[PDB]
Write a protein that binds this ligand. Sequence first.
Ligand code: SF4
Ligand code: SF4
Ligand code: FES
Ligand code: ZN
Lengths: 687, 386, 198, 114, 118, 83
Amino acid sequence: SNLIEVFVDGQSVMVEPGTTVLQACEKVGMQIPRFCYHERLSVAGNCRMCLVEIEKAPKVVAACAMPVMKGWNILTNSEKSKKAREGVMEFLLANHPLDCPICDQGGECDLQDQSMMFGSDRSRFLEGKRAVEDKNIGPLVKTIMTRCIQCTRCIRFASEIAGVDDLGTTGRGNDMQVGTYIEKMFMSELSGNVIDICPVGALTSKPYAFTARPWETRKTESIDVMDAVGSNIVVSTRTGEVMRILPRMHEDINEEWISDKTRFAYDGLKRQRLTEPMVRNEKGLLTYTSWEDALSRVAGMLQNFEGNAVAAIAGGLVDAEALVALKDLLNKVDSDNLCTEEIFPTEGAGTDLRSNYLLNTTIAGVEEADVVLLVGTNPRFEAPLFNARIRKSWLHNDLKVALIGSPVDLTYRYDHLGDSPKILQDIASGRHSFCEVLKDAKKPMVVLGSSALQRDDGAAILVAVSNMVQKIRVTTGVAAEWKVMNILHRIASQVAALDLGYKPGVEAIRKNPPKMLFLLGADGGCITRQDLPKDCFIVYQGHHGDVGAPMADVILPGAAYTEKSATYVNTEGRAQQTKVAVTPPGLAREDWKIIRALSEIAGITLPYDTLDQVRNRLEEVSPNLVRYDDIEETNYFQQASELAKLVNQEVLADPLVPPQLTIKDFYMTDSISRASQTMAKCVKAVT
Amino acid sequence: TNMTLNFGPQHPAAHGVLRLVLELSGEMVRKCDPHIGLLHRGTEKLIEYKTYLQALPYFDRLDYVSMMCNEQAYSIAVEKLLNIQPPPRAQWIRVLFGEITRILNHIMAVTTHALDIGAMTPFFWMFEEREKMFEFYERVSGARMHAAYIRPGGVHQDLPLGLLDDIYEFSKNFSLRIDEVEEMLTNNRIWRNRTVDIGVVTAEDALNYGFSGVMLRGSGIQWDLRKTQPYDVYDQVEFDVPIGSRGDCYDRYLCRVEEMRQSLRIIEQCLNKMPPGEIKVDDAKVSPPKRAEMKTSMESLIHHFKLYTEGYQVPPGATYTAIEAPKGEFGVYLVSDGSSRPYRCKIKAPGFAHLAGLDKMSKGHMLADVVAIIGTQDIVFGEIDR
Amino acid sequence: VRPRSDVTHKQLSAFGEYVAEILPKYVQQVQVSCLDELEICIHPDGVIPTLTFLRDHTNAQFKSLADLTAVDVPTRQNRFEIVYNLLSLRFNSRIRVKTYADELTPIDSIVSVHIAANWYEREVWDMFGVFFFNHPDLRRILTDYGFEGHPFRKDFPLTGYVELRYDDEVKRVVAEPVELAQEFRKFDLNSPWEAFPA
Amino acid sequence: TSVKPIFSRDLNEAKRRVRELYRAWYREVPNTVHLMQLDITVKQGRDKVREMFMKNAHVTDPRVVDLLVIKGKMELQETIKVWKQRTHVMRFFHETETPRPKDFLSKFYMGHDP
Amino acid sequence: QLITVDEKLDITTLTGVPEEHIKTRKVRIFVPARNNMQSGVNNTKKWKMEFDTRERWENPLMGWASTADPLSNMVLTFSAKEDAIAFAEKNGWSYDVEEKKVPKPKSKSYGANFSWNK
Amino acid sequence: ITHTGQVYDEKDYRRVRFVDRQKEVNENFAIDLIAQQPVNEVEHRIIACDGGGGALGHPKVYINLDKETKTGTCGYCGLQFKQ
Ligand code: SF4
Ligand code: SF4
Ligand code: FES
Ligand SMILES: [Zn+2]
């Protein structure tokens, strides 16, 4: 049923009714040469470079457009469909400016290839060419738009994938130029994708203007650590320094798109970077010294100090492998004061059941939802490729989005229930209007952002939301595998840390001050040296000198996610593996080894000595860490609620506000981001 | 060990580098086990990592006495895989420089043979003629040797305006220069002795050990791949293969002097009948676009950029194409995936087979005989070692 | 367009069946390629028998061995693809007989059928590691005397693992693990767009 | 499974061949150290032979062992026949190269990738 | 007659690889993704197994990148996942296969976006 | 010193090289040479730029000197054209 049989050159493929002629060729395996057709962008038919010839038909048809009908054999390599490409390519090239040795989409051109495979050996355009006027679309995208083949994929993406709706066509004839009518910069996250989506090199990346050329770039597939969506990405490295980071497709997490932060902050990765292990000198300044000396500075203090006098404030981009090597070390001197900077409420079941702290409705479950209750977070600037998810599911499907936060730019039409944590109680009572809207929802989903939890009444906010999820679930009678409650994070090493049993919040360190603290990539201000005991002996374990370095008795440089085979996990627990794109710089070493080595100098040696062994260690403390690309299906929401019901807390009237109110808030957050000259240029452009 | 004595790598007598571990009862050779690979350099593996056009320079280096004739074999092979054939003028060129190259190889083989024998004046006489020929190469390609002129789709650039005339003056005279060598060696009362009846190879044995060259032709087997399986336009010319009888070092020599003579007959024709036309295929797909065109037409720049950066993208297949390089049958077995860079390129070297025969040729022979036989095989260690 | 002569394509095809019938036992596939060549593919056990028939048959005399080579398709279970290219001086033609050999499953040697193969078989062992039974003297030909590893295997690094320099302390040439001063830049060249097969 | 034999039908028969080669090398070590004027001790060399013959002690498959001696025998021929000049033989001893420590702490202190 | 061996073909002893690069080298079998730059999918067809990346220190005299790892530039191409896994087992290199992820079917129709309703 | 100001430094371990042997640097740096080039005034909205000499120049490109606000600069010659 619903399976027409169409022949692609007599191959009798069978396709659902409503599949385009181009799609029919794909399942046989043939590729229609195409421009202006992108899988996740609307069909436009602008280029008509895809003209094919259905058999027994007078004219050739537009592949991307004609819904294939019953028994129409497509002839993709006929004598006609080649004159329908040999003659289109004649036109695209005719008005094209031949500056291919300027166009940094040199080998990354879908227009030279198709010319070089399906087009014509020579040109007949003896007439003159046209020229358009380069304008400014911002500090990230260089629009040398005299290159544009008017394929309108930008105008689509800028409207359909991102809700900018700014880029547009202006004029008619051969001087239709697809640029902003007034010069207003294209400022939005998801902005850099235009580069990747314009097959022509008209608008390309300005930082990566002319640093390389694609054949040279060695491409290593790794994971996004800047944000907690854990978007898949490919790090393009030449002769050992990263040159670009561009998206690689993951259906569920980032489907071909990556954030503006995690593709222009590769520059931040190359400066202010720690490399040699400095130690505090008698004079009082950090002096570069060999590992042996720096490690025993730390080891000697560690042997002297007992449990609860040694603490670790990890946080930010540290991998799961270091996080278990730091816990195994501090327990071998019996302090379990290991903690993370982002406070996740842990008075009821927290960290114990693995659903209190996960977006368990999958990133791909936003597509099959019905009503989303965004509470206290700006997804646009905390998980940009999850904001897109709710963008697509509000457009192609029909999600009814509701926000209980600050009224904020969300790239879609949301319902602003209010800016008050207590109105969460209003819906639980059934008093507020939306209460029925959910009642009407067969598959609803609440999403509590981590930043709402970071306030003082965060424990109360989680409990209040869990009560509402409980009766939302009861009133809707939603099926068990549909999961209403989920919470999204904004720190890469938070789900992994909570997974390994790290207890969130520095509240424990606050009540009893540790003689020694091993900051593990922590650039947050959660504890300061004035706050620390008189000794204030703390040793920074990280990659960039930002806030923790200048207040550090020891500097043990580490690596970054471009420089180690570590593991990370995003918000719905999908563990993922970063691969080493570039060897770590200077004497700097992998985070897990520094801690295995410090343990050997200390004498409480950790068991693993190779990374497969540390992966085996992760397996004993937690399951997700070893199985990659695998979301954990079952969760135990019912017992979580019981403990939530026991917890009694007051939600203060102060409105819950996301810290990233507008996009300048977004550009600089983590260490690598802060160290970005490109991000800095972006910040001043906004200001 | 019957006084085993390495002929030694450093020996003026041993062209290039040849350790011939020989056990000699006094001055008689009992067994010759040639050692090879003193010049293995990886030419076959390196090519797999290079594109078709950037592997063309390797072929000139495989056997560089015969610089171009080797290039024609890869050319032909890559043209077959693409089912493209060079333009008419290019074909004649390749036969023009194909033959000039044969002379160059024979002047090398006959004169270097004599230097090891002990006659030194023929080498200086003909190296001056060689020199003059190199200059043709240079004024056509840019390099005296290692030109890279014959590319997979024709030659690279048309002949300079005036070369043909000079490849005439030279040809018009070279004969006398071959004649002189003759008055010095063909009938020397002494050349004959050291060469006659040394290294006789039967006809059946020559085919069996895969000799395939003058070495076969010298034994009386009639086989010139240029007449049996014509390549380029060697079909339109008329030449006589110099077959030999009583095959021995002297007879084959006479054959090499005779092909020097016959090549002048082929060169003459090529000068007399070379057509007006283009020297490279017009498919920008295979041949790079003319520089005026790539600097004024977009399709030509795109084709220039892709061709130089990525490559031909030969259709998947495999072919063994053999020409008649001056030494003998030079063949390239070029397996190719659809990629722009080859998958395998075994170079059949007329020379791997010939050396092997050294054992079956130099039996019960004196130390001096071994020196004469290495000469009558024109061993260039580049082709053998590849 | 090359000047194909169908006259050939047919005659060689006809011989391909001829051989296939004459030796049903070892011939697995016989095909005439478009270049117009012919390749009879034989089970490794048919190395001796198929060659001998071609060297000594009145209607197919294939006296000289042009070449013996071994492509290495790592994906293929039987890694190596020994290819023997043979020439008929009489009937004027060439046929290629190609077999498959894995790393530790040796092929028979044809030095008996053609002594030309004495050297090429040593060349295939040195570069690819296939072994040839009944070979008179199989030993490395092209590689260094102490070389470890078979070089033309697709799984062998181009630069290799050892390089040589003269050390004064020991006054003798000495291997050291390869340390290269500009690694081979591995340009990726394949284009993501195919060419519609004619 | 189901694999055609190369020289022996079983590890047992194969081991016979290894014994022979060991003997061969054992008897040869002294000669080489003298015909190549190598600056090594016969005893020392003979231990090296043992080293190599055991470096591959783990092999359980008969076919792999058979090739190993074929290769081993070939090496013998070369050495016995002076084809391999000292430089070639001494390489076995890895005399010039600086030994690398395998201790984790050692590697940590020196190389980015251990 | 054939003989029986249950031993996983391991031929690490014949390949001729230095001990360090057989026990410390992890190779990943993966199908290459597509540079988002181009929309062609002809480079996302065959599986490839690639050895782990190693040191690339700058050269003091000219600043060229320098590498001490021989198996770095080597990427072997295998048609199917099963065959690539076999190569790792007999050569003795450790392997961590990544499942191919192919684009999910997506429903598209020019008429659908013309819907003012939605 | 040089174009991109290469300055092996007073503390570098490479400046050792020039000892007793000079460094290769360039006078008439190009960075300033086109800046020294006069702005080619034109009448037409768009203009070509063969680089001068056709085949002996650069792939011809047409520059849009349409805004006096900006003198078009052929990406190949760095020549500014004044509408
Ligand atoms: S886009 Fe850039 S690269 Fe592709 S053709 Fe036009 S100029 Fe050459
Ligand atoms: S800019 Fe790139 S995408 Fe937007 S239209 Fe011109 S070409 Fe198509
Ligand atoms: S690809 Fe056919 S319409 Fe653009
Ligand atoms: Zn210019």
